[PDB]
Amino acid sequence: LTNDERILSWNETPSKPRYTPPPGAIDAHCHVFGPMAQFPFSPKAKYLPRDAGPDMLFALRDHLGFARNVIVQASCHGTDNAATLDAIARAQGKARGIAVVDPAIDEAELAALHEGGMRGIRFNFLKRLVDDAPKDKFLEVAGRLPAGWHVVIYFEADILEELRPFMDAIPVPIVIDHMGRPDVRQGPDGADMKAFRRLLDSREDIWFKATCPDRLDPAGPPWDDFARSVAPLVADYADRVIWGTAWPHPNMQDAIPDDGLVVDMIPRIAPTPELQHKMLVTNPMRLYWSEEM
Numbered sequence: 001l002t003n004d005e006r007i008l009s010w011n012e013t014p015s016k017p018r019y020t021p022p023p024g025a026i027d028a029h030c031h032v033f034g035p036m037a038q039f040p041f042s043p044k045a046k047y048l049p050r051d052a053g054p055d056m057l058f059a060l061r062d063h064l065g066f067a068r069n070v071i072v073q074a075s076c077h078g079t080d081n082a083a084t085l086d087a088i089a090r091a092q093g094k095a096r097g098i099a100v101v102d103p104a105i106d107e108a109e110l111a112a113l114h115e116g117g118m119r120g121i122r123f124n125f126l127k128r129l130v131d132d133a134p135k136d137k138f139l140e141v142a143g144r145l146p147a148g149w150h151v152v153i154y155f156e157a158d159i160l161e162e163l164r165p166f167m168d169a170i171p172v173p174i175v176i177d178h179m180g181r182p183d184v185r186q187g188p189d190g191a192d193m194k195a196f197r198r199l200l201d202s203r204e205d206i207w208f209k210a211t212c213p214d215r216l217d218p219a220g221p222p223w224d225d226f227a228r229s230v231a232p233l234v235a236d237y238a239d240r241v242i243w244g245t246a247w248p249h250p251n252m253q254d255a256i257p258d259d260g261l262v263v264d265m266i267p268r269i270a271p272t273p274e275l276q277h278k279m280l281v282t283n284p285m286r287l288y289w290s291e292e293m
């Protein structure tokens with residue numbers, strides 16, 4: 001199934017960001033897709049993306065001015081982490097990863113994923129992406145992970161309440177993708193942000209990605225609602241926040257973001273050198289390269 005027939009969801013000639021990330025900056029949420037010929041997609045995949053391999057990822061990384069990446073297993077590859085693992089290997093020390101695993105995965109396989117640069121697993125509660133999300137089995141496997149791993153959790157705001165018991169029971173630290181998709185139109189003190197802050201206030205070891213204005217702010221760039229709603233969250237939880245591009249933007253074909261503009265959101269949500277250093281360097285290093293910290 002030929003590449004130019006599959007779904008393009010990224011800008012092939014992104015603008016240069018006006019903002020220059022600091023030395024050592026980490027794009028802590030990105031993906032590779034395939035290449036399909038070497039790494040086929042999962043039968044459970046709900047989208048069939050165009051190839052977005054390691055060389056494309058590193059070209060994008062370099063174009064935007066990032067030093068390192070956390071390469072997150074994409075749902076189009078299911079529980080086969082091979083493409084992600086190859087991308088991490090090809091990064092020559094400049095990447096770590098997040099895996100998606102069968103909840104029955106054995107400890108030997110988990111150790112091998114660790115050796116291959118994985119530092120956590122992802123639980124995806126979006127039905128449009130993954131049919132099944134067995135909370136019982138997720139809780140089980142979350143307690144069998146290699147030392148120093150965390151879980152990454154992706155959900156929509158309308159199920160945050162229902163997930164509070166599950167997240168409270170998770171025995172390792174938690175990273176929340178895209179803040180659990182709050183409606184940034186509401187403002188920084190709106191309903192979704194208040195609910196999200198209740199979650200953050202329940203456990204000290206819940207971190208979040210301050211990410212994806214393209215996904216959350218339907219007005220489009222400059223995404224003023226995202227900027228105004230998210231900046232206070234970054235400022236109030238400065239030691240618990242990380243950031244990523246979300247390139248190559250799975251499922252964003254209807255509103256393909258310009259990565260230059262995506263990166264230019266950073267100094268809006270993190271206006272000071274202090275917040276930029278924490279969000280882009282210190283915090284993701286603590287989660288993903290703890291041995292260097």
Ligand SMILES: O=C(O)/C=C(\C=C(/O)C(=O)O)C(=O)O
Binds near residue numbers: 154
């Ligand atoms: O990659 C993201 O950050 C978000 C999306 C896709 C996935 O989480 C995935 O396929 O693994 C989405 O919202 O469509």
